[PDB]
Design a protein around this ligand. Structure first.
Ligand SMILES: C[C@@H]1[C@H](O)C=C(C#CC2=CCC[C@@]3(C)[C@@H]2CC[C@@H]3[C@H](C)CCCC(C)(C)O)C[C@H]1O
Length: 253
């Protein structure tokens, strides 16, 4: 029964633009990482120790800072986003940043050993690394679950970049002024996504893929609340700010 409308010339364009935006902002070789402050892995096999040292924090904060800059760059090329006021652009970037970083990080995530593999052993990040950056299992374990859940959807790159764009252009972020315009931009991206799935995604029995992706968006909101709680406590550690970057302080402060 269900109709399979073809992608319009405009939806084809939107997909091309977003894939292009991603390829410009996402280096799949991680060749910039040698520019971050080095990773340090003390032995913890302890919350006290990990707060006293924060030995992976300078490195992972440089990584997340770098990632925020790429997301700002990616967001600028989303069809519609530049029609928003600069103020709503900033609201959306700030509230979705850690969610988009979690999403985009799925490209370096691997179920080989459940790590984000960006190298070159030094640039392989495991649960134990995230705890050495002062985060707790209440964030890390659901984060790894989300990464696996996401991997197992086997998204086309078209799906992956549309899902990042939809995450960023969310009319329900606290503090937006033009909700209708944002919802209008998002609706254009969601319709492209829905159409894509039904045309392009084999069998296609899993048009059902759309609801699952939407559910990931909801998972991302809970991860975002938890990160915020833990970043707050991490920020209580004396001289923590030296281990972050101005951009990370602004975005999460
Ligand atoms: C660079 C590419 C992508 O943007 C992200 C990547 C990653 C990763 C990550 C690897 C280890 C866990 C993370 C550091 C990120 C994903 C988000 C994690 C945490 C929750 C952020 C903590 C931030 C703070 C200390 C400030 O609270 C790798 C590449 O896929």
């Amino acid at each position: 029964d269900s109709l399979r409308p073809k992608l319009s010339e405009e939806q084809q364009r939107i997909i091309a633009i977003l894939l292009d935006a991603h390829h410009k902002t996402y280096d799949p070789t991680y060749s910039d990482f040698c520019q971050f402050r080095p990773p340090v892995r003390v032995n913890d096999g302890s919350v006290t120790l990990e707060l006293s040292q924060l030995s992976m924090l300078p490195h992972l904060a440089d990584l997340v800072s770098y990632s925020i800059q790429k997301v700002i760059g990616f967001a600028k090329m989303i069809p519609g986003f530049r029609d928003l006021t600069s103020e709503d652009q900033i609201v959306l970037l700030k509230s979705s940043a850690i969610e988009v970083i979690m999403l985009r990080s799925n490209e370096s995530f691997t179920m080989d050993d459940m790590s984000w593999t960006c190298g070159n052993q030094d640039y392989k990040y495991r649960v134990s690394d995230v705890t050495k950056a002062g985060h707790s299992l209440e964030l890390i374990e659901p984060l790894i679950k989300f990464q696996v859940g996401l991997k197992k959807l086997n998204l086309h790159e078209e799906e992956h970049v549309l899902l990042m764009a939809i995450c960023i252009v969310s009319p329900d972020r606290p503090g937006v002024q033009d909700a209708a315009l944002i919802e209008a931009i998002q609706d254009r991206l969601s319709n492209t996504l829905q159409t894509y799935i039904r045309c392009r995604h084999p069998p296609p029995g899993s048009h059902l893929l759309y609801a699952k992706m939407i559910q990931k968006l909801a998972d991302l909101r809970s991860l975002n609340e938890e990160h915020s709680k833990q970043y707050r406590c991490l920020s209580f550690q004396p001289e923590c700010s030296m281990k972050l970057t101005p951009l990370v302080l602004e975005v999460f402060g």
